[PDB]
Amino acid sequence: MLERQLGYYLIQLYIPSLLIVILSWISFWINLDAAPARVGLGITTVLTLTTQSSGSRASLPKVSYVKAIDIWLAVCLLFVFSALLEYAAVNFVSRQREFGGGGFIQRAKKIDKISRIGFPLAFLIFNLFYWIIYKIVRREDEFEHHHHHH
Amino acid sequence: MLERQLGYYLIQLYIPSLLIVILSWISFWINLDAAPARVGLGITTVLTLTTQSSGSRASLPKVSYVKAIDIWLAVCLLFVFSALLEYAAVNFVSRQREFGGGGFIQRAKKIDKISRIGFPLAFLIFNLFYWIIYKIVRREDEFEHHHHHH
Amino acid sequence: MLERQLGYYLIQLYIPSLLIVILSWISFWINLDAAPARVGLGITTVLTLTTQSSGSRASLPKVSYVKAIDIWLAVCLLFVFSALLEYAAVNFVSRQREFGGGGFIQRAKKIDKISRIGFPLAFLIFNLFYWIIYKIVRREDEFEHHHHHH
Amino acid sequence: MLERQLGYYLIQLYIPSLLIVILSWISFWINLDAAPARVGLGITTVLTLTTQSSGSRASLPKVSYVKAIDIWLAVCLLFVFSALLEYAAVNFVSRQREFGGGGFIQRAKKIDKISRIGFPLAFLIFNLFYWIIYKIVRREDEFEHHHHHH
Amino acid sequence: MLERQLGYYLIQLYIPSLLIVILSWISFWINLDAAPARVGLGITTVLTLTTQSSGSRASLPKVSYVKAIDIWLAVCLLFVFSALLEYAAVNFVSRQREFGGGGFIQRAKKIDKISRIGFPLAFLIFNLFYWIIYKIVRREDEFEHHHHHH
């Protein structure tokens, strides 16, 4: 009868599950070709760590399933959507999307322009799951004491 | 009891399962050799996402199995049939199938001629499963209101 | 109760399982090093497609097991025996097994001499499982009407 | 009944599980790019060897679970934390973290400066699990007879 | 119970399991970097072929487990111990363990000096499991008739 009391174990378990995820991308900028083997393990570890995190079925994850489906129906399509954009952009270079193909062969230099979106992407998620976790427990923001601005 | 009522969950679940599939090929172009590691994960994710999508067996997927077998007995043989054609064409270049082997070493340029079949291949499938889903529910096209041209 | 009646499902299921296998080798000549990632997935897909094809245990695959063991005790040792011969031959070049090491560095040309054994290897298996399937059902060749020469 | 008596099987089982882990890093140096395929198997073998080491559930690993959670909530986040630092440092070279980018292209030389942290990292863990195992059984250090210094 | 009568199925099953293992190393030479993907599948196939060879639990593998543990507690630590030595030796070249680093870049030649230990390593194991299998059944060597020398 602890179906609704599962979120508690998902919160403390999400902390580490998210931290390891942020580092994954930090190493994806290189695994893009140098060693994509790690990228394939990290992406499968996140979906395998969550699916196995509810195998006991002793806490009645049923309820936590439906609710998790409303959120899982976008996080997986968006998480692999940004990864492919780059995993396919390398070859899309010929598209000349830029203002000139003068730096075509000079692209291997790796200006690390990929960390410009990932960096702010990890902080946004970490703060999106941290504020949402302490918010849901309130619903009407009774003890939120977070912003209180608006 | 809800064996025939499973198609509903397969429809909304197919949307995301198909979208991620289309993007897979878009990257398969470069993954052809640059990083085929991703191509191997995406191809196994589609067959693993469907087989696991009916593990509960609470909706009695039995009926949905037989019907799914009549369609699964071609989609898997055709999906991996086109992928191999290219995965083996790279070395088939020596065959000189073209009108001349003058551009043998100039083939690495990657003219992106592979996106000429994939692009229209994704739209055909997306529209083939979208029109078929809203059609099957009718059988005799009672509320189809799709073409009505005939 | 349908233990001996399983061969029927194995026949129609072997057709597609064999077709996809033949194509695997056709792409192995290149995956030998260019992208062996696919070769590892195709080889594991055949053994995983059969082992999972009898997970229901509703047709009593028991009987079909002992009989499948007499044949499985050679097809797996021979299937991976020919693959290794080539997967290890590349480095065996130094052996100078040929009539001269003059074409050592000129071996990368890939004369496609590997398709000389694979081609006839796929047709032999396809015809070996097709004639054996329609033969076993007879035992004494009552309605064979295949050769009738001898 | 033997939930608290599981540590015994975990101790003798940890010896070999730790030894194989130390060797993993020793090879991770070259696997960093030369062949990261092995690094991905060794990292998944440690988490798969432990999770499967308690599948019997005949010794009531329940109790051993909670206690293992207090330690597993850092060993996995720290083990993959150091691996990524290097798996992403290769490309971080452009950061010029050093005192000069003069040896940028001369970095491939592989001075083996990575074995300076791994070596002492394996001995620290081996001695951390060896002294902790013989210590926990005491709690108050009754028969420790290890240091007895201060 | 046929717990002690399991060794019979393990003997005839070990023959093929060992043969495929010997060939694995023969290819590991080139797979050391050229295509280590196969080496990772062969090493996981041996541990996966044995663990799954006792999934039925109908023959009461319990007894065969304890006895198998006394031998499995060294074969796995020694099998992966020799593989790592080479998988990490490539980078250990800088160690100058040899009598001179004059042939540093001339090491890629691949003198096939690795087959000097593997060859005799496969024959030793094949004869170690063949003589031990026909010996255990005797215990006191009643019908051994193998050596009878001294």
Sign of the CA dihedral running D112, D113, D114, D119: positive
Are C43 and C27 in contact, with CB atoms under 8 Å apart? no
In chain E, residues with a C-beta closer than 8 Å to the C-beta of C43 are 41
Q: Length of chain D in residues, anyone? A: 150
Are C14 and C129 in contact, with CB atoms under 8 Å apart? yes
How far apart are alpha carbons E126 and E120 in whole angstroms?
10
Are E121 and E25 in contact, with CB atoms under 8 Å apart? yes
How far apart are alpha carbons D55 and D95 in whole angstroms?
46
Q: Which of B107, B87, B68, B67 is nearest to B25 (CA)?
A: B87
What angle (nearest 5°) sits at the alpha carbon of residue B44, between those of residues E44 and E42? Answer: 15
Interface of D with A in 56-85 (CB under 8 A): 73, 76-77, 80-81, 84
Q: Which residue from E minimizes the CA distance to C62?
A: E56
Are A38 and D40 in contact, with CB atoms under 8 Å apart? yes
Least Cα separation, residue B70 to chain C (angstroms): 12
How far apart are alpha carbons E74 and E80 in whole angstroms?
10
- The structure tokens listed for A29 are 């900028």
Spatial CB neighbours of B144, under 8 Å, sequence gap ≥ 6: B134, B135, B138
Least Cα separation, residue E139 to chain C (angstroms): 29
Are D86 and A29 in contact, with CB atoms under 8 Å apart? no
Spatial CB neighbours of E110, under 8 Å, sequence gap ≥ 6: C91, C94, E29
CB pairs under 8 A between C and E: 49
Spatial CB neighbours of E19, under 8 Å, sequence gap ≥ 6: C77
Would you call B24 and A94 a contact, using CB atoms and an 8 Å cutoff?
Answer: no
Are D26 and D141 in contact, with CB atoms under 8 Å apart? no
How far apart are alpha carbons C59 and E36 in whole angstroms?
40
What are the C-alpha distances in Å from D94 to residues D34, D72, D88, E1?
21, 34, 11, 66
- Cβ-in-10-Å burial (0-12, 13-18, 19+) of C97 comes to exposed
What angle (nearest 5°) sits at the alpha carbon of residue C93, between those of residues C90 and C95? Answer: 135
Would you call A88 and B41 a contact, using CB atoms and an 8 Å cutoff?
Answer: no
**Which residue in the block uniquely carries the two structure tokens 């890093």?**
D25
How far apart are alpha carbons D25 and D118 in whole angstroms?
7
Enumerate neighbours of E (3 or more CB pairs within 8 A): C, D
Are B80 and C20 in contact, with CB atoms under 8 Å apart? yes
Q: How many CA atoms lie within 13 A of A65 on its CB side?
A: 10
Are D42 and D25 in contact, with CB atoms under 8 Å apart? no
Q: Three-state SS across E65-121?
A: HHHHHHHHHHHHHHHHHHHHHHHCHHHHHHHCCCCCHHHCHHHCCCCCCCHHHHHHH
How far apart are alpha carbons E17 and E7 in whole angstroms?
14
Spatial CB neighbours of C63, under 8 Å, sequence gap ≥ 6: C3, C4, C6
Would you call C20 and B80 a contact, using CB atoms and an 8 Å cutoff?
Answer: yes
Q: Three-state SS across D56-118?
A: CCCCCCHHHHHHHHHHHHHHHHHHHHHHHHHHCHHHHHHHCCCCCHHHCHHHCCCCCCCHHHH
Q: Which of E67, E71, E48 is nearest to E129 (CA)?
A: E71
How far apart are alpha carbons D89 and A23 in whole angstroms?
12
Are C29 and C114 in contact, with CB atoms under 8 Å apart? yes
How far apart are alpha carbons B10 and B50 in whole angstroms?
9
Spatial CB neighbours of B18, under 8 Å, sequence gap ≥ 6: B125, B126, B129
- The structure tokens listed for A50 are 């969550």
Selecting from E32, E33, E94 the residue whose C-beta is nearest the C-beta of D110 gives E94
- The structure tokens listed for D28 are 């991770």
How far apart are alpha carbons C52 and C13 in whole angstroms?
12
Would you call C37 and B33 a contact, using CB atoms and an 8 Å cutoff?
Answer: no
- The structure tokens listed for C131 are 């004639």
- Could you give the 3-state DSSP secondary structure of residue D45? helix
How far apart are alpha carbons C93 and A80 in whole angstroms?
43
Spatial CB neighbours of B90, under 8 Å, sequence gap ≥ 6: B32, B33, C30, C34
Q: How many CA atoms lie within 13 A of D149 on its CB side?
A: 2
DSSP letters, B90-144, are HHHGGG--SS-GGGSGGGTT---TTHHHHHHHHHHHHHHHHHHHHHHTTSS-SS-
State the maximum Cα–Cα separation within chain C, in Å, rounded to a whole number.
64
Name the DSSP class of A138: T
- The structure tokens listed for B88 are 């083996």
- The structure tokens listed for A11 are 């919160």
CA dihedral E97, E100, E106, E108 (to 10 degrees): 0
How far apart are alpha carbons D54 and D3 in whole angstroms?
11
- Rounded to 5 degrees, φ, ψ at D133 are -70, -40
How far apart are alpha carbons E104 and E97 in whole angstroms?
11
In chain B, residues with a C-beta closer than 8 Å to the C-beta of A91 are 29-30, 34, 110, 112
Name the DSSP class of E137: T
Residue B54 parent element (H or E): none
E26 touches chain C (CB under 8 A): yes
If one counts every other C-beta atom within 10 angstroms of the C-beta of residue D50, the result is 15
What angle (nearest 5°) sits at the alpha carbon of residue C109, between those of residues C107 and C113? Answer: 75
Residue D29 parent element (H or E): helix D7-31
State the maximum Cα–Cα separation within chain B, in Å, rounded to a whole number.
64
Give the end-to-end CA distance of chain D in Å, rounded to a whole number.
37
How far apart are alpha carbons A128 and A130 in whole angstroms?
6
- The structure tokens listed for A102 are 């003068």
Spatial CB neighbours of B83, under 8 Å, sequence gap ≥ 6: B28, B39, B43
CA B71, distance to chain mean position in Å, is 12
- Could you give the 3-state DSSP secondary structure of residue D8? helix
In chain B, residues with a C-beta closer than 8 Å to the C-beta of C38 are 36, 39-40, 87
D52 touches chain A (CB under 8 A): no
Q: Which of A19, A5, A102 is nearest to A63 (CA)?
A: A5
Are A77 and B19 in contact, with CB atoms under 8 Å apart? yes
Name the DSSP class of B31: H
Crossing angle of helices B7-31 and B62-87, rounded to 10°: 10
Are E67 and E7 in contact, with CB atoms under 8 Å apart? no
Are B124 and B31 in contact, with CB atoms under 8 Å apart? no
Are C29 and C113 in contact, with CB atoms under 8 Å apart? no
Selecting from E26, E37, E40 the residue whose C-beta is nearest the C-beta of C84 gives E26
**Which residue in the block uniquely carries the two structure tokens 């077998």?**
B69
B29 touches chain A (CB under 8 A): yes
Q: Which of C82, B53, C50 is nearest to E52 (CA)?
A: C50
E19 touches chain C (CB under 8 A): yes
**Which residue in the block uniquely carries the two structure tokens 């997927």?**
B61
CA dihedral A117, A122, A127, A129 (to 10 degrees): 120
Interface of D with A in 91-110 (CB under 8 A): 91, 94
How far apart are alpha carbons D133 and D127 in whole angstroms?
10
CA dihedral E99, E102, E107, E113 (to 10 degrees): -30
Are A121 and A24 in contact, with CB atoms under 8 Å apart? no
CA C53, distance to chain mean position in Å, is 17
Spatial CB neighbours of D75, under 8 Å, sequence gap ≥ 6: none
How far apart are alpha carbons C36 and A34 in whole angstroms?
16
What angle (nearest 5°) sits at the alpha carbon of residue A146, between those of residues A144 and A150? Answer: 100
In chain B, residues with a C-beta closer than 8 Å to the C-beta of C34 are 33, 90-91
**Which residue in the block uniquely carries the two structure tokens 């055709």?**
B78
In chain E, residues with a C-beta closer than 8 Å to the C-beta of D26 are 84, 88
Query: Regarding the domain delimited by E1-150, which CATH topology (the fold level of the hierarchy) does it fall under?
Result: Methane Monooxygenase Hydroxylase; Chain G, domain 1 (1.20.58)
What are the C-alpha distances in Å from D129 to residues D71, D135, E73?
12, 10, 19
In chain C, residues with a C-beta closer than 8 Å to the C-beta of B40 are 37-38, 40-41
B37 touches chain A (CB under 8 A): yes
What are the C-alpha distances in Å from B104 to residues B33, B91, B94?
17, 11, 8
DSSP letters, C15-61, are HHHHHHHHHHHHHHHHHTTS-HHHHHHHHHHHHHHHHSTT-S-SS-T
DSSP letters, A82-108, are HHHHHHTHHHHGGG--SS-GGGSGGGT
Residue B65 parent element (H or E): helix B62-87
- Rounded to 5 degrees, φ, ψ at E22 are -60, -40
- Rounded to 5 degrees, φ, ψ at B100 are 160, 145
CA dihedral A37, A39, A44, A45 (to 10 degrees): 100
Categorise residue C104: left if φ over 0, alpha if ψ from -120 to 50, beta otherwise.
alpha
Sign of the CA dihedral running C49, C55, C59, C63: positive
Selecting from A40, A77, A90 the residue whose C-beta is nearest the C-beta of B41 gives A40
CA E132, distance to chain mean position in Å, is 15
Enumerate neighbours of B (3 or more CB pairs within 8 A): A, C
Least Cα separation, residue C129 to chain E (angstroms): 23
In chain C, residues with a C-beta closer than 8 Å to the C-beta of B87 are 27, 30-31, 35, 38
CB pairs under 8 A between A and B: 49
How far apart are alpha carbons A33 and A91 in whole angstroms?
12
Spatial CB neighbours of E27, under 8 Å, sequence gap ≥ 6: C84, C87, C88, E38, E39, E42
Spatial CB neighbours of C81, under 8 Å, sequence gap ≥ 6: E23
In chain E, residues with a C-beta closer than 8 Å to the C-beta of C39 are 37-38
Least Cα separation, residue B26 to chain A (angstroms): 7
How far apart are alpha carbons B114 and A91 in whole angstroms?
12
Burial profile A81-98: b = 16 or more Cβ within 10 angstroms, e = fewer: eebbebbbebbbbeeeee
Are B131 and B146 in contact, with CB atoms under 8 Å apart? yes
If one counts every other C-beta atom within 10 angstroms of the C-beta of residue E125, the result is 15
- The structure tokens listed for C87 are 């997967």
As a whole number of Å, the CA-based R_g of chain B is 19
Are D53 and D13 in contact, with CB atoms under 8 Å apart? yes
Are E60 and C62 in contact, with CB atoms under 8 Å apart? no
